[PDB]
From Swiss-Prot:
It catalyses: (2E,6E)-farnesyl diphosphate = (+)-epi-isozizaene + diphosphate. Mg(2+) 3 binds at N225, S229, E233. This is Epi-isozizaene synthase. It comes from the Bacteria. One of its GO terms (molecular function) is terpene synthase activity. Mg(2+) 1 binds at D84, D88. The Asp-Asp-Xaa-Xaa-Asp/Glu (DDXXD/E) motif is important for the catalytic activity, presumably through binding to Mg(2+).
Length: 340
């Protein structure tokens, strides 16, 4: 029963959830990976990992992915949550040097992951293992695009480190631009391609309908995270959230800000419904009778179908995951699943 302020009747009615058939094995295999890579302590893995629903989030998204592709995506996604937690803890504890060194290591590992599989920082080693596996599915040109995108993500996290240590809340437009990077919009968009087995040509993935559908799926995911994660973030002195920027820069009340974020999220849905018609028409057009055309058509159709699945997977994840259940914590500023 979704809280009334967070409920989206259009998602519930018109975006039925899907779940990949590999999910049961995925749940246990990513938990074992978090344990074996020492990304969380064993007692915290046992108590909290399944309840965090990280594998459920990806298995509701990349439908049709080969099992090995889904496994690498799920491990990387769980890694990305643990990295968000490390970044938060380094900010809270004023560990500017530790963050700077981790930032530099991630840039280097991203370009040479095999070299870093046994690094002394288990967070770097776990990153490198997941990225090396993601780099084994498609040509080097896709790997280079993933790396270009993630270098940009790392730098967006560095900007957040400086904003939070200096007390700065970004302006609304500044925030919206930063949030496309901190939520990793273009990484999730890149990962559609190994999931459907095809690196798309620039001419296809930059088609305006593919681009706009991809963008709106990610804006929904990030802004719905902002809507649902606002309480945990206020409690933890996090400043990065569309609602916080609106309160600060536009002088809205909390209630006014939550309503404006919710309206922005609802508009993403109905803008997506419009452009989805065009992106599926484009998938139809690619099927021109040729073998290549059929391949590209099926890949675009699968990817646009997963851009739609992201809406329902992200919506339910925020009500199922222990990650956001701040009311259940003894110390609302310190989630129990982080290493403090
Ligand atoms: C910290 C996790 N994330 C990606 C999973 C940062 C890249 C933001 C996010 C959280 C939840 C749903 C959508 C995005
Ligand atoms: Mg966070
Ligand atoms: Mg973050
Ligand atoms: Mg958030």
């Amino acid at each position: 029963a979704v809280p009334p302020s967070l409920r989206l009747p259009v998602i519930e009615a018109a975006f039925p959830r899907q779940l990949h058939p590999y999910w049961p094995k995925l749940q246990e295999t990513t938990r074992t990976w978090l344990l074996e890579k020492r990304l969380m302590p064993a007692d915290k893995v046992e108590e909290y990992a399944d309840g965090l629903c990280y594998t459920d989030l990806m298995a509701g998204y990349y439908l049709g992915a080969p099992d090995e592709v889904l496994q690498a995506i799920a491990d990387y996604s769980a890694w990305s949550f643990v990295w968000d937690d490390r970044h938060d803890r380094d900010i809270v504890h004023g560990r500017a040097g530790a963050w700077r060194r981790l930032r530099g290591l991630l840039h280097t590992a991203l370009d040479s992951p095999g070299d870093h599989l046994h690094h002394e920082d288990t967070l770097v080693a776990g990153f490198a293992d997941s990225v090396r596996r993601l780099y084994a599915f498609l040509p080097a040109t896709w790997n280079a695009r993933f790396a270009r995108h993630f270098h940009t993500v790392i730098e967006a996290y560095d900007r957040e480190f400086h904003n939070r240590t200096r007390g700065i809340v970004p302006g609304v437009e500044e925030y919206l631009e930063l949030r496309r990077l901190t939520s990793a919009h273009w990484i999730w968009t890149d990962l559609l391609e190994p999931s459907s087995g095809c690196e798309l040509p620039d001419a296809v993935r930059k088609h305006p309908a593919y681009r706009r559908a991809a963008l709106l799926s990610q804006e929904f995911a990030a802004w719905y995270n902002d809507l649902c994660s606002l309480p945990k973030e206020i409690a933890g002195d996090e400043v990065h959230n569309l609602g916080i920027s609106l309160i600060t820069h536009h002088s809205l009340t909390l209630e006014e800000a939550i309503g404006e974020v919710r309206r922005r999220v609802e508009e993403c849905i109905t803008e997506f419904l419009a452009v989805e018609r065009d992106a599926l028409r484009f998938a139809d057009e690619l099927a021109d009778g040729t073998v290549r055309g059929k391949e590209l058509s099926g890949a675009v159709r699968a990817n646009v179908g997963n851009m739609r699945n992201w809406f329902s997977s992200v919506y339910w994840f925020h009500h199922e995951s222990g990650r956001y259940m701040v009311d259940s914590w003894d110390d609302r500023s310190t989630p129990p699943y982080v290493n403090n």
